Design a protein around this ligand. Structure first.
Ligand SMILES: *Cc1cc2c(cc1C)nc1c(=O)[nH]c(=O)nc-1n2C[C@H](O)[C@H](O)[C@H](O)COP(=O)(O)OP(=O)(O)OC[C@H]1O[C@@H](n2cnc3c(N)ncnc32)[C@H](O)[C@@H]1O
Ligand code: HEM
Ligand SMILES: c1ccc2[nH]c(-c3cscn3)nc2c1
Ligand SMILES: O=C([O-])CC(=O)C(=O)O
Ligand code: SF4
Ligand code: F3S
Ligand code: FES
Lengths: 613, 240, 102, 139
């Protein structure tokens, strides 16, 4: 009841997250003179970004000569024109300044003959706006880019007086009349409950990949922010767009970097054919993530399955110089052994497309301001920001380009901090909250803390995971999505049959993983219903029944002589999902993609077209 | 065709009045389990007992979350594959000489605070020009960083150094020490002398007596001791 | 930067090499000067050696300062005695010789 | 905003004011050759320093010269192999600490600090101990 002691805190800002995005935003605020709190359930270093391998994109032109505007082109193209071009302008432009900031922070990038940041080839990247051949702009710390990045940022973060709430589990946002007043969180260490309130709040909680049975992401990718936003009655955007990374270990589903392919790696089927040379003649196995894994999954259907079960594919590396494999790809070389017993110098890795990245998340400005959808128009939610995988300024659209999330993180983390700095002053009036506020979060906590029902958390979690896995995979049909939809909705009902066993205040990992399950459910529920509704094939979301890109026009031939379809008649628009928490009923809406850049003169708008690699 | 393994596991509930640190046994059909000790830990959590409390995340060995004493040695539960030998009972403990918050979850606040004291970030005498151009560093100068930058602050090393057991407050320990060295040999760093000058007391660096448990136990295959030796040499030979 | 620590450390290694040299040196040259230099090296290295063991295990201001005091006394008593033995008795090189033929 | 030093104090004030146990250390840690050879160096080190100290102090506190003390020892049943053994266990600690001390100095230079190079060196130190302790008890 009032069994829980409430401790109240006062700040200028609160950042929820200590991943790349979280940290960059956190000390970004401190640096601008803001009394800042950062709230994270993991120790900052443990955050998922640490796992990141490939690299971080900037048009620095260390390998060849480059233009950030070519990076811009690549990103919008890859996004299948569901990507908001204003945000892509802002990102791809700020890219070199952002990478340089990191290197100047201390990030130990691999180095060229010039002793400049080494860059490498990556999937779906070109020179001269898709013309002048393969681009080499992915900046990397050898094989462990995300590792270094996170530590570098963490290291740097120690320099400022940010108040850190480590191993605190954020429960909900403190919401008062459409405005964000702060957060409410559980202190895992002693079980006490904390109301951290601030004038501004940043959500940087990363993705919800754990909604699936097989995914490359951490056990802590539980869409905790997405859910918090959903519980506030705010929209989440484009959640049906889930990235299936081509190359992940057949067993434990650990990620093997795309940098493997950018370093000369090849993809091979059961009869040895480099099947990717036939599926995408120009770019080959350095095409998009959605095209490559589409091809892989298809080759398995075809019959060309590999291994005893004929249910995976081979990523070949053995033909590459061993010097190169040691220098350019040490991290994978080791875990290829550890998890598969594979020597990369002599034999191919057993790979399978698995869930990897959440394009969708919280709708956002190019400024990082969280948006709601009032009267078919956009609206800035006062005191609310979001960045990283958690967010969706959809700078990534329908398909996220390789090595763009690490970029996303730092760019928009910084952006959030700048938006606050440039809108208000530190030490300004911190908006007051009701004494009752956060009441139901504690009530929800208590109910879960003493749960006695028929079904245990792990059982229910496994049901949701296998269902999402079989009904919301690479390819999906209206019938299978339909079954999945009601399958999940029923499982949402089951949440009040929950069995918890642990009943302590300290480190109740039984209770949190249940709070994580409530969170994952909302994320899945919105993912699946959104998927069923989108009757087209755009980017990562491929429908068997509707294999066509449904735009305002038919961009296979020139426009004008064509009549423009009205808004709710085409599909080139953002999916906005809600859910009535009690019932679990999903309701959807739509907002238009942004096509105007930040300056037509500096960066031309790239109009939709046929998208082939 | 079954195949069962035994797991002896350290337990402690701070929320069960007058609970004393004790072991608890579980049994797992290894046919229904992934190869790693974590897989097992998760499987007993998910099925047999969810009062079992441990840190985990990446299940890949980069976050540094597992970090527990497994059969005498400190490694990562997601890295260590269990002994298929059914005759041996697997012994899982928390990280040695550390305060147990609950079960296999040790208070690392000191380990973290110690890392903060070395200032693990690049430092320039003139930082007015930062954020403009990428700093220069040869592929050679860069090589001096390999085997150093890879540390995942898992704390296996520091927490297997017997000097750290008896002097954990004032002695910085291998991981944290190796990191200071990691910033010492960074060409781009300007504060090399003052970094060394901070280890000028009996306790900070000089409790290391080359026992070499650190290097012995590092799940990431790193050599903290060798780096500590290198610091010791730098300390003796630097000028002022 | 009063390099007290890093000096003390090298000084330790300096006597450590010194004490190693004086062993075969004493056997190959069992003179009286070799008795005194072997007494200084012996008790110094031993005093710094236990000094380490002290700082490792002896917790507090009360205990740690006391243990150092009592160690300094023991060391002084040990060095003086070895000097005495060199002067008013056999000398440690011959004392080993005499002891060994037995 | 909190100092590394401020954090450390709070770590101690919290944990010493708690009822938390320390996880087991030596009682559960698996032993290895170098791990045992490190305390042996402390053992032999401490033992030897006690020997040297007992010698110097008795030379000041006890009356009668060394020559008479030796004759006092001769005045006793001294089996050729019981004078050998009573002497071997006086060389043995010294020879181990001598050899392992050399290894410690090679380390101080920075050489041989890999794990293979440590089991190799440890064994060599262990063998040399035996040979020099038997080759001096027979001298
Ligand atoms: C899985 C993966 C992803 C990945 C990659 C390799 C793998 C195996 N490699 C990449 C690469 O080479 N280049 C690139 O651009 N991206 C790569 N990715 C994708 C990318 O790494 C991730 O999308 C990105 O790292 C996400 O980072 P973000 O800052 O958004 O946050 P996070 O690292 O996922 O961690 C989330 C943080 O939020 C806190 N949190 C979460 N829930 C809560 C609650 N309830 N309360 C408080 N805090 C919470 C966590 O503590 C964590 O710090
Ligand atoms: C000439 C042969 C000897 C050499 C080369 C030698 C060298 C060393 C070295 C290198 C150490 C450990 C320092 C470290 O941890 O790096 C040590 C420990 C020590 N030695 Fe010696 N030593 C020798 C003989 C002796 C003798 C005869 C005594 C008796 C007075 C002695 C007393 C000690 C003590 C008390 C320690 C401390 C043990 C510890 O803290 O680990 N040593 N020695
Ligand atoms: C196990 C426990 C305590 C230990 N202390 C040492 C040691 C102290 S000085 C040189 N080595 N080694 C140890 C091994
Ligand atoms: O999401 C990413 O950019 C990437 C990824 O799997 C990698 O190549 O490491
Ligand atoms: S050096 Fe190795 S054992 Fe020590 S904290 Fe780093 S990864 Fe862990
Ligand atoms: S375990 Fe130890 S005392 Fe030194 S060499 Fe390693 S830190
Ligand atoms: S959980 Fe990442 S280290 Fe094992």
């Amino acid at each position: 009841s009032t069994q829980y002691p409430v401790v109240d805190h006062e700040f200028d800002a609160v950042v929820v997250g200590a991943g790349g995005a979280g940290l960059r935003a956190a000390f970004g605020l401190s640096e601008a003179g803001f009394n800042t709190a950062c709230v994270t359930k993991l120790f900052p270093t443990r955050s998922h970004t640490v796992a990141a391998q490939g690299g971080i994109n900037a048009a620095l032109g260390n390998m060849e000569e480059d233009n950030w505007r070519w990076h811009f082109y690549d990103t919008v193209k890859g996004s299948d024109w569901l990507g908001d071009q204003d945000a892509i302008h802002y990102m791809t432009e700020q890219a070199p300044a952002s990478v340089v900031e990191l290197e100047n922070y201390g990030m130990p990038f691999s180095r060229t003959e010039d002793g400049k940041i080494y860059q490498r080839a990556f999937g779906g990247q070109s020179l001269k706006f898709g013309k002048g051949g393969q681009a080499h702009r992915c900046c990397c710390v050898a094989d462990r880019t995300g590792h270094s990045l996170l530590h570098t940022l963490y290291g740097r973060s120690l320099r400022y007086d940010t108040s850190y709430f480590v191993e605190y589990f954020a429960l909900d946002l403190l919401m008062e009349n459409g405005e964000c007043r702060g957060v409410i969180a559980l202190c895992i260490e002693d079980g006490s409950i904390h109301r951290i309130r601030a004038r501004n709040t940043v959500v940087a909680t990363g993705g919800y990949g754990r909604t699936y049975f097989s995914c490359t992401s951490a056990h802590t990718s539980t869409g905790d922010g997405t859910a918090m936003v959903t519980r506030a009655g705010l929209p989440c955007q484009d959640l049906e767009f889930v990235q299936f990374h081509p190359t992940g270990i057949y067993g434990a589903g650990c990620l093997i970097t795309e940098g493997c392919r950018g370093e000369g790696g090849i993809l091979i089927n059961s009869q040895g054919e480099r099947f990717m040379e036939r599926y995408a003649p120009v770019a080959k196995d350095l095409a998009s993530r959605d095209v490559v894994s589409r091809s892989m999954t298809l080759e398995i259907r075809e019959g060309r399955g590999c291994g005893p079960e004929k249910d995976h594919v081979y990523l070949q590396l053995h033909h590459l110089p061993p010097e190169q494999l040691a220098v350019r790809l040490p991290g994978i070389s080791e875990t290829a052994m550890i998890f598969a017993g594979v020597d990369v110098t002599k034999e191919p890795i057993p790979v399978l497309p698995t869930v990897h990245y959440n394009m969708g998340g919280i709708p956002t400005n190019y400024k990082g301001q969280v948006l709601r959808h009032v009267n078919g128009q956009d609206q800035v939610v006062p005191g609310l920001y979001a960045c990283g995988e958690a967010a969706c300024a959809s700078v990534h659209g329908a398909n996220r380009l390789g090595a763009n999330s690490l970029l996303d993180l730092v760019v928009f983390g910084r952006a959030c901090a700048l938006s606050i700095a440039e809108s208000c002053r530190p030490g300004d009036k911190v908006p007051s909250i009701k004494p009752n506020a956060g009441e139901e979060s504690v009530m929800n906590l208590d109910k879960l803390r003493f749960a006695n029902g028929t079904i245990r958390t792990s059982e229910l979690r496994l049901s949701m995971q296998k269902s999402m896995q079989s009904h919301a995979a690479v390819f999906r049909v209206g019938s299978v999505l339909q079954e999945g939809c009601e399958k999940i909705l029923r499982l949402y009902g089951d949440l009040q049959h929950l069995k918890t066993f642990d009943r302590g205040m300290v480190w109740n990992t039984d209770l949190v993983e249940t709070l994580e399950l409530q969170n994952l459910m909302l994320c899945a529920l919105q993912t699946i219903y959104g998927a069923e509704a989108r009757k087209e094939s755009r980017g990562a979301h491929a429908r068997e029944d509707f294999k066509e890109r449904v735009d305002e026009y038919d961009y296979s031939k020139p426009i004008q002589g064509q009549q423009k379809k009205p808004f709710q008649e085409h599909w080139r628009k953002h999916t906005l999902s809600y859910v009535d928490v009690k019932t679990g009923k999903v309701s959807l809406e739509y907002r238009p993609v942004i096509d105007k850049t930040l300056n037509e003169a500096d960066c031309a708008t790239v109009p939709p077209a046929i998208r082939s690699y | 065709a079954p195949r069962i393994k035994k797991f002896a596991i350290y337990r402690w509930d701070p929320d069960k009045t007058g609970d004393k640190p004790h072991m608890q046994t579980y049994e797992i059909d290894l046919n229904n389990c992934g190869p790693m000790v974590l897989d097992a830990l998760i499987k007993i959590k998910n099925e047999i007992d969810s009062t079992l409390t441990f840190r985990r995340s990446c299940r890949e060995g980069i976050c540094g979350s597992c970090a527990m004493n497994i059969n005498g040695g400190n490694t990562l539960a997601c890295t260590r594959r269990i002994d298929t030998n059914l005759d041996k009972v697997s012994k899982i403990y928390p990280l040695p000489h550390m305060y147990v918050i609950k079960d296999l979850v040790p208070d690392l606040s000191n380990f973290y605070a110690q890392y903060k004291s070395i200032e693990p970030y690049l430092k320039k005498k003139d930082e007015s020009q930062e954020g403009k151009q990428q700093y220069l560093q040869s592929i050679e100068e860069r090589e001096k960083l390999d085997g150093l930058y890879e540390c995942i602050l898992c704390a296996c090393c520091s927490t297997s150094c017997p000097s750290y057991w008896w002097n954990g407050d004032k002695y910085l320990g291998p991981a944290v020490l190796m990191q200071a060295y990691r910033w010492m040999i960074d060409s781009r760093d300007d504060f090399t002398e003052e970094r060394l000058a901070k280890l000028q007391d009996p306790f900070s660096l000089y409790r290391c007596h080359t026992i070499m448990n650190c290097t012995g136990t590092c799940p990431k295959g790193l050599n903290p001791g060798k780096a500590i030796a290198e610091i010791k040499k730098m300390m003796a030979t630097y000028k002022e | 930067s009063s390099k007290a620590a890093s000096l003390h450390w090298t000084g330790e290694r300096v006597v450590s090499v010194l004490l190693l040299g004086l062993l075969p040196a004493a056997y190959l040259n069992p003179c009286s000067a070799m008795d005194y230099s072997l007494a200084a090296a012996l008790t110094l290295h031993g005093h710094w050696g236990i000094g380490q063991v002290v700082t490792d295990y002896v917790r507090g201001d009360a205990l740690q300062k006391a243990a150092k005091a009592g160690l300094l006394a023991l060391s002084a008593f040990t060095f003086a005695g070895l000097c005495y033995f060199n002067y008013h008795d056999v000398g440690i090189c011959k004392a080993v010789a005499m002891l060994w033929k037995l | 905003g909190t100092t590394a030093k401020e954090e450390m104090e709070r770590f101690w004030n919290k944990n010493l004011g708690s009822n938390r146990p320390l996880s087991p250390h030596i009682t559960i840690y698996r032993w290895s050759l170098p791990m045992a050879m490190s305390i042996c160096h402390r053992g032999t080190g401490i033992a030897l320093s006690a020997g040297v100290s007992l010698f110097g102090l008795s030379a000041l506190l006890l009356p009668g010269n060394f020559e008479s003390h030796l004759e006092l020892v001769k005045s006793l049943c001294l089996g050729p192999t019981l004078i050998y053994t009573a002497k071997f266990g006086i060389v043995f600690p010294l020879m181990y600490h001598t050899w392992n001390g050399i290894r410690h100095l090679i380390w101080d230079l920075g050489k041989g600090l890999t794990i293979p190079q440590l089991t190799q060196s440890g064994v060599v130190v262990l063998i040399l101990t035996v040979l020099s302790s038997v080759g001096l008890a027979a001298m």
